[PDB]
Design a protein around this ligand. Structure first.
Ligand SMILES: CCCCCCCC/C=C\CCCCCCCC(=O)O
Ligand SMILES: CCCCCCCCCCCCCCCC(=O)O
Length: 154
């Protein structure tokens, strides 16, 4: 589902990409070949969000920005294949669990769960929450991974 009573303003700011689960080997491999620094969530010039991710690739700092357009309900967004992105659960000041699925085109084959943490190294219980969520969503244990982090690029 989507986080009930989702408050976008409390979801803004700095998050760390701590955990990932995907049914795409290509995407898993791509993400694992990098080191995550931080992500920043900010309101876009429309009712959606800009998600700016900073990471290290071959010792080079890089950034990518993703526009998450509103999808007609709070906590639900769209990214253009087209993908649905949902904030399924969050307490705003510790963690957020995101879920993405293709909604149009070949991307429909694609599913991804993400654990965002307000701290770069998340508590063990946060990791358990994520694993439990991924298992509930039909991800195999081997696809549930915690991404390499970097202190650089901050
Ligand atoms: C608009 C897309 C921007 C994605 C930036 C995400 C930052 C993660 C680091 C490297 C991305 C390389 C993998 C390509 C798949 C897109 C990742 C995703 O689902 O967010
Ligand atoms: C962290 C914010 C989530 C962003 C939502 C977009 C997720 C990924 C979109 C690119 C998918 C590329 C995967 C190709 C694999 C396949 O289609 O089988």
């Amino acid at each position: 589902s989507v986080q009930p009573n989702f408050q976008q303003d409390k979801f803004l700011g700095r998050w760390f990409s701590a955990g990932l689960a995907s049914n795409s080997s290509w995407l898993r491999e791509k993400k694992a070949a990098l080191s995550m620094a931080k992500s920043v969530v900010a309101p876009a010039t429309d009712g959606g969000l800009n998600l700016t991710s900073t990471f290290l690739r071959k010792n080079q700092c890089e950034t990518r920005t993703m526009l998450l357009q509103p999808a007609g309900s709070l906590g639900s967004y769209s990214y253009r294949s087209t993908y649905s992105v949902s904030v399924v659960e969050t307490d705003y000041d510790q963690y957020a669990l995101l879920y993405s699925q293709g909604s149009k085109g070949p991307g429909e084959d694609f599913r991804m769960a993400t654990l965002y943490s307000r701290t770069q190294t998340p508590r063990a219980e946060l990791k358990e929450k994520f694993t439990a969520f991924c298992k509930a969503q039909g991800f195999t244990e081997d696809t549930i991974v915690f991404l390499p982090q970097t202190d650089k690029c901050m």
